[PDB]
Amino acid sequence: MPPRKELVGNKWFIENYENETESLVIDANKDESIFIGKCSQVLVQIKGKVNAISLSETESCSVVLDSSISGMDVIKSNKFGIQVNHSLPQISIDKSDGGNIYLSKESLNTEIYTSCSTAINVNLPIGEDDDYVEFPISEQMKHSFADGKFKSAVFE
Incomplete structure (x- = not known):
């Protein structure tokens, strides 16, 4: 599978990219969607608002986006980094190992x-006025019967 960086209809596909020295850029439109898959050591920079962003099967990749109407998805991706310049309702991470999100006052x-x-x-x-403050996300859950009800809870 050779490099791919094509727009098909309203869907941007960026697949099969190895150790990229320079930043891979895309000038999208609010009606377009971005799909990134099978990439390693790559930094896709999405300029302009988009309808969606999806990071799939990647290693040490970073997505720099302005905003996304429906959010972003991350699946089977390790060492990922997301930086949001403006906003997006949600970011969903599944079966992924090691990721670092950077939201914005807006987002x-x-x-x-x-x-x-x-x-x-x-x-x-x-923090000290627009100064990043890390928040390690818990990966443990506790489940038990207490006080007549079997409630759940994140482990702190």
């Missing part, structure tokens, strides 16, 4: 869902 409320993932860190610019 400070971005919901985050994780499933079967590890070493995920979310940094909000809430």
Whole structure:
């Protein structure tokens, strides 16, 4: 599978890229979607608003985006890094190992869902005025019967 960086209809496909020295850029439109798969050591930079972004089967890749109407998906991706310049409702991480998100004042409320993932860190610019503050995401759950009800809870 040789490099791919083509727009098919309203879907950007960026696949099969190895150790990329220079930043891979895409000038999208709000009606387009971005799919990134089978890549390693790559930094896709999505300029302009988009409808969606999906990072699939990647190793040490980083996505720099402005905003996304429906959010972003990350699946089977290790060593990933996401940086949000503006906003997006949610970022979903599944079966991924080691990831680092960087939200923005705008994107400070971005919901985050994780499933079967590890070493995920979310940094909000809430410190000394727009100064990142890491938040290691818990990967453990406790389940038990207590006080007449069998409740669940994240491990702290």
